[PDB]
Amino acid sequence: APDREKALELAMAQIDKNFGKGSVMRLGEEVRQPISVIPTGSISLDVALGIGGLPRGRVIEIYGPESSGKTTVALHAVANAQAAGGIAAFIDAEHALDPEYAKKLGVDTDSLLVSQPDTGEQALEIADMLVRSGALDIIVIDSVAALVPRAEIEGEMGDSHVGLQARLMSQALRKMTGALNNSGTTAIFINALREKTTTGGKALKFYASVRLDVRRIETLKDGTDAVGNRTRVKVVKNKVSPPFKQAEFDILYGQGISREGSLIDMGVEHGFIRKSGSWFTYEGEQLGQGKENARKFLLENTDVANEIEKKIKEKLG
Ligand SMILES: Nc1ncnc2c1ncn2[C@@H]1O[C@H](COP(=O)(O)OP(=O)(O)O)[C@@H](O)[C@H]1O
Fold this sequence. Notes:
One of its GO terms (biological process) is DNA repair. InterPro entries: AAA+_ATPase, DNA_recomb/repair_RecA, DNA_recomb/repair_RecA_CS, P-loop_NTPase, RecA-like_C, RecA-like_N, RecA_ATP-bd, RecA_C_sf. This is Protein RecA. The chain is built from eleven helices and 13 strands. Helix 7 (about 165-185) packs parallel to helix 8. Strands 5-4-6-7-3-8-9-10 form an eight-stranded mixed beta sheet, with helices on both faces. A three-stranded antiparallel beta sheet has the order 11-12-13. Strands 1-2 form a two-stranded antiparallel sheet. It is an alpha/beta fold.
């Protein structure tokens, strides 16, 4: 009586029932479940997530080298969430946030709750009190690395020179997740890479439903003079869709994730926009000869690149 595929399913089902939808899943599988998500502001990355954005009520971690593009995405999330009429809280602990830029990304700073904790404990706690209030859609934390314990913030000797930070970070998540689910608020934990872990990413890794690995990969020289930098995000972990997908998206200086950029990329691979010979075209239209000229084309003739986005939106989701 051995039938693998029938015996496998029964097992898989059990596996999912004992540990939750997504415990295990074939890699090239398509997903009925839409969740309800917060657009990552990166169409590519969105598809890359397989639900069109950051799932809600889950602990997300966006890690990666400095200036890779983590924040911007975390900020875009916020902005979107707020358009959907959601309230957002920024548990700042690095003091870098540029509200100005943030508004340019569409964030409504004036309605954005900001907190700058005195300690790691406080920082996580303050965020917990807010989470379980239920009034939030998304709550971003800046720099897991900065969630330094109190005994360390205050002057405490190199005795009980423990593995204390990550501890703090586990207990805090052990209880904040439960509420995030009940609350359905999405927690984006920005965790940045170092010197020479993060002493606190050890816990996260296991408590995060989604873990994006943000990376810098190119300087958009364009007309041989800097505009912005191209980014690549790997979805190393996804418990709401098949993991390991990949997306690339532009981020010009001063500007956030380039919509037209996205369009001209996703367009090409998905072939609605056919072009090569170092030139670009759509439905026979002369877009221009460099990704930039094109980006600009779309940026200007708003009408086009709208039917494209459309055309692309259809074929995917
Ligand atoms: N305050 C700013 N002013 C101008 N450009 C910015 C600013 N912050 C971010 N950017 C742009 O957004 C990109 C990503 O920034 P950011 O997300 O802060 O890097 P990180 O990965 O350390 O969080 C930067 O490379 C730059 O192109």
